[PDB]
């Protein structure tokens, strides 16, 4: 399902809001994308369905720390 493995981001519900202020149930979807990440410490490519923000989370924390987290909450990669 459209869930970022780094951040938990997922679809949210809201309204489109016309000029005349008509609300209509709508969705916001996270900017998802599956990305191969070279894990040096694992001589392997781990590919993650991540949100763009996710990627930035990975760039800052470093993929080892992030995978460390998935491992910590038994999110299987």
């Amino acid at each position: 399902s459209r869930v970022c493995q780094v951040t938990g981001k997922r679809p949210v519900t809201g309204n489109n809001r016309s000029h005349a202020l008509n609300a209509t149930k709508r969705r916001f979807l996270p900017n998802l994308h599956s990305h191969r990440f070279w894990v040096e410490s694992e001589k392997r490519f781990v590919t993650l369905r991540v949100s763009a923000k996710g990627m930035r989370v990975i760039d800052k924390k470093g993929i080892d720390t992030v995978l460390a987290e998935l491992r910590a909450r038994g999110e299987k990669y």
Binding site: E40, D59, G62
Partner: protein, 149 residues
């Protein structure tokens, strides 16, 4: 990002600078093929320890691979016991492991392949000269005197 480099790296890098690169380039190419790394600050000082050490320290140690020759001109004369044929012309002859082994064997300790006797290298008696090598730019002259005993 910022990211600090590893190898030389083309139109931007250096060998250990703190450039700034588009993340698309950092992930996907550079860091994976370890040519650079996240400037995680933790790191940028991992590099400050690496800005004092090898450089400031081991180049006044090549100021010792250099001041070995401050003792190349303060003696400036070894003699070789090599005689003379029919007119003061060496009955012997002295090369590099003769001018490095008859250099080492005193207070003048040189590495045997650090003695340039361009050939003369050698074919007569008396005083000669040689080019003594310890550094790439700083060598030093002496005077050699094949003594006919």
């Amino acid at each position: 990002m910022q990211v600090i480099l590893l190898d030389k790296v083309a139109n931007l890098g250096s060998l250990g600078d703190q450039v700034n690169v588009k993340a698309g380039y950092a992930r996907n190419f550079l860091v994976p093929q370890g040519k650079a790394v996240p400037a995680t600050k933790k790191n940028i000082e991992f590099f400050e320890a690496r800005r004092a050490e090898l450089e400031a320290k081991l180049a006044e140690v090549l100021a010792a691979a250099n001041a070995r020759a401050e003792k190349i001109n303060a003696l400036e004369t070894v003699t070789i016991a090599s005689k003379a044929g029919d007119e003061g012309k060496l009955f012997g002859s002295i090369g590099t492991r003769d001018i490095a082994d008859a250099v080492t064997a005193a207070g003048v300790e040189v590495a045997k392949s650090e003695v340039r006797l361009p050939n003369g290298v050698l074919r007569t008696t008396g005083e000669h000269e040689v080019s003594f090598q310890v550094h790439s730019e700083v060598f030093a002259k002496v005077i050699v005197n094949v003594v006919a005993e």
